[PDB]
Design a protein around this nucleic acid. Structure first.
Lengths: 104, 77, 50, 67, 131, 154
RNA sequence: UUCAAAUGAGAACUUUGAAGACUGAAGUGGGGAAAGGUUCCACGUCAACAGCAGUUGGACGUGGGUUAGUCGAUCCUAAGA
RNA sequence: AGCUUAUCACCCCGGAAUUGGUUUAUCCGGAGAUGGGGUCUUAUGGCUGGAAGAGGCCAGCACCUUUGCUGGCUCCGGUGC
RNA sequence: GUGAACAGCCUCUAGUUGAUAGAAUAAUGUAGAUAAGGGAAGUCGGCAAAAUAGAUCCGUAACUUCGGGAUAAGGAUUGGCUCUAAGGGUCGGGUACGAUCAACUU
């Protein structure tokens, strides 16, 4: 009925460059994801677990890929990584991070 | 464009001595929930109109593709 | 008028081929009194009246 | 700093007239961005490694240029 | 100076003011004087149908029912609640005549206040019966 | 140089008006060599001419204004500037009112709640007034079928 | 209307970018009928014209460009010739 | 291009006052109402063919370069003086 | 979008930024305004300008060819924010309601 979807984010490409850290990212999701209004209202409806390169979100509740894109642009603006790091969909419900065209 | 249901009717049209080129097109569609499955269409070019033949089964396609006349030029995709 | 008759069109073609300055080598002939194309036309200045 | 970044953002945008240019279609100069990341505090040793018959009717009559 | 303030607030076109209207409700005589005025030809309602709070004559008795049910007249009721701002409020702010001012606030809280609040409570009962 | 051509010409290729296309000032020699549409497709996709996507025209205030209109705000006599017939014509009210009283009586007659003799009186009495709305008519049927029953008892 | 850059012997006026505004779907937008006849586009280029200016133009010089069994005419008749 | 789809109109059985059907607008009925069962015009709509291979939105490689190639998705609804 | 509205005002797609310019702010002008107390004393003459105006409710004269006169005159009111009431469909009843669903009007 409430059939869950697996949402995967690759953060390996900014991890090796050192401007990004994945551990503080995965903490930032688990409190700010809003289930029916208030933050923290989830009772095991989502899980946020990380590889170190792969962040995985499994949600039984109402949760969509554009909204998952919405939270990561919140996080890169706090860390001032916007103008430099974008959030792309490579395949469906599978996402990764990239730099821009830095070339002189 | 005409749609042809009968498999027998379509086999005569390749033998009509008016058709020079044909083409096969492979499509991937869905039944209600079901599974992803391939779908084939056989198109033969008469002088007047374009005859087509919709085969939803994957198995009957492999039977019918060999049954084409050999001088009849066949296009793939 | 972009729906023109042929008789109207044929007089445009003659006016088009007369829309030219005088050739440079006619300056060089003997006893040339001819200087400039004194029948020169322009669409802005003078209407050619069909 | 919060008043400066708001004051910095006023001259940048001007959203009501035209647009903000897309960051994806534009490209960076290496330039300022290593200066910006130095202010955040990330080291730049690793990212430096990736950087390292016309027929003119006037003049078809006379051929020589002196005439 | 502007256009609109000169239209309504000239000296020619001035209403009574918020001081004298409070004194009219202060006693039972002037309540019954103003309600039961003799008919006069110059006045708009021919000297009848007069609201005490908003010093304004109404034409018809139907023009009181629509007037008492409105945000204009509910405004003037809320305006006349407290101490009516005489000159003595202005001078007491400077540090001048406190005990003249303190006796007036003492009397209006004790004596004149609930007597005025009784007189308004009988107007709402009187205008209910005639209308 | 003069670049009114390629400004116009890239507008035809991308399919957007001339106010949108962007030609960078650093490549002023590379763009001026292009004098054909075929070069412009190459000059667009390697990132010299881009699109400049649409100027925003948000509708957030419009939805938040209209949301209070659902709850019944901004509807006093101060906001109105047209008559009732301009706002909601009395024919449009009557047509909504009088088709309800036709198809209510249509579905009682087929279901057997009412016979055809009492149908034809409530039909023409609904063509005039005395049935203001849907609840007021069903109350009348209860009274009329009671008056039919009380006469049937006697 | 404003600022830099390129072009140029030269720039309030040309080109690009960044700004600021306006026409606001009975428009300063997208096509057409009469009417005009190459003004349409490119290359070169400024003595004259564009009531200021000019590197630019509806200017000047040289060239390029309108494809129909189905869209029109052609056929029919109206008031009438 | 194929199959199907409609107010009006029409036929058959049936015989109606205790008048009935019916539109926003009061007209129809023994010259046969209501009802029950049918026929037709295809304005128009639905699906399939045309036809996804096209178009559109993105992502990824190529690269002085003729400039392409490879991938994904292109779905399902709702309302009206 | 506001509104009775293709009104007026602002915006999106599209297009234009062309109409000689620079510096100062004298008189008199052309265009547009405000003014203490009095209110037509001005003047051929209330010329011009000011005033009234949209909307709901109350109310309307002489006269009249009975249709009009009529928006006659005249009088109350209008914002905001939280509310309540009334006005509908589509389904389920042996041949009273319950469910669900969606509108802006007062």
């Amino acid at each position: 009925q409430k059939i869950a979807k697996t949402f995967t984010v690759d953060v390996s490409s900014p991890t090796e460059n050192g401007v990004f850290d994945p551990a503080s990212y995965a903490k930032y999701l688990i409190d700010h994801i809003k289930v029916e209004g208030a933050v923290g209202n989830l009772g095991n409806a989502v899980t946020v677990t990380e590889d170190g390169t792969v962040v995985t979100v499994v949600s039984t509740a109402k949760f969509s890929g554009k909204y998952l894109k919405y939270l990561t642009k919140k996080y890169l603006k706090k860390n001032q990584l916007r103008d430099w790091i974008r959030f792309v969909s490579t395949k469906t419900n599978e996402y990764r991070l990239a730099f821009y065209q830095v070339t002189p | 464009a005409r749609e042809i249901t009968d498999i027998k009717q379509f086999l005569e049209l390749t033998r009509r001595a008016d058709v020079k080129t044909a083409t096969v097109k492979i499509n991937k569609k869905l039944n209600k929930a079901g599974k992803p499955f391939r779908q084939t269409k056989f198109k033969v070019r008469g002088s007047s109109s374009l005859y087509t033949l919709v085969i939803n089964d994957a198995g009957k396609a492999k039977k019918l593709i060999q049954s084409l006349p050999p001088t009849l030029k066949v296009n793939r995709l | 008028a972009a729906q023109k008759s042929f008789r109207i069109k044929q007089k445009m073609a003659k006016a088009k081929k007369q829309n030219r300055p005088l050739p440079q080598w006619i300056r060089l002939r003997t006893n040339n009194t001819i200087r400039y194309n004194a029948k020169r036309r322009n669409w802005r200045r003078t209407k050619m009246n069909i | 700093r919060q008043k400066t970044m708001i004051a910095e953002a006023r001259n940048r945008k001007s959203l009501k007239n035209k647009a903000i240019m897309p960051r994806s279609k534009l490209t960076k100069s290496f330039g300022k961005m290593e200066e910006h990341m130095s202010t955040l505090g990330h080291d730049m040793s690793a990212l430096q490694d990736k950087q390292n018959r016309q027929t003119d009717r006037l003049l078809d009559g006379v051929a020589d240029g002196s005439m | 100076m502007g256009r609109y303030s000169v239209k309504r607030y000239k000296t020619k076109r001035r209403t009574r003011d918020l001081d004298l209207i409070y004194n009219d409700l202060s006693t039972k005589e002037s309540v019954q004087k103003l309600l039961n005025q003799p008919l006069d030809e110059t006045k708009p309602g021919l000297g009848q149908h007069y609201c005490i709070h908003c010093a304004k004559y109404m034409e018809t008795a139907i023009a009181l029912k629509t007037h008492l049910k409105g945000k204009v007249h509910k405004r003037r009721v809320k305006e006349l609640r407290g101490v009516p701002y005489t000159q003595e409020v202005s001078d007491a702010a400077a540090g001048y005549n406190l005990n003249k001012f303190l006796n007036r606030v003492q009397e209006i809280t004790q004596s004149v206040g609930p007597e005025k609040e009784s007189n308004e409570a009988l107007l709402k009962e009187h205008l209910d019966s005639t209308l | 140089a003069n670049l009114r051509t390629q400004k116009r010409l890239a507008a035809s290729v991308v399919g957007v008006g001339k106010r949108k296309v962007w030609l960078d000032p650093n490549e002023t020699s590379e763009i001026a060599q292009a004098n054909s549409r075929n070069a412009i497709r190459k000059l667009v996709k390697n990132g010299t001419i881009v699109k400049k996507a649409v100027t925003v025209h948000s509708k957030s205030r419009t939805r938040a204004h209209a949301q209070s209109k659902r709850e019944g705000r901004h509807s006093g006599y101060g906001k109105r500037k047209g008559t009732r017939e301009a706002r909601l014509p009395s024919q449009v009210v009557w047509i909504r009112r009088l088709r309800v009283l036709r198809r209510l009586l249509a579905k009682y007659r087929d279901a057997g709640k009412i016979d055809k003799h009492l149908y034809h009186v409530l039909y023409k009495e609904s063509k005039g007034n005395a049935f203001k709305h849907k609840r007021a008519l069903v109350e009348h049927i209860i009274q009329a079928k009671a008056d039919a029953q009380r006469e049937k008892a006697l």
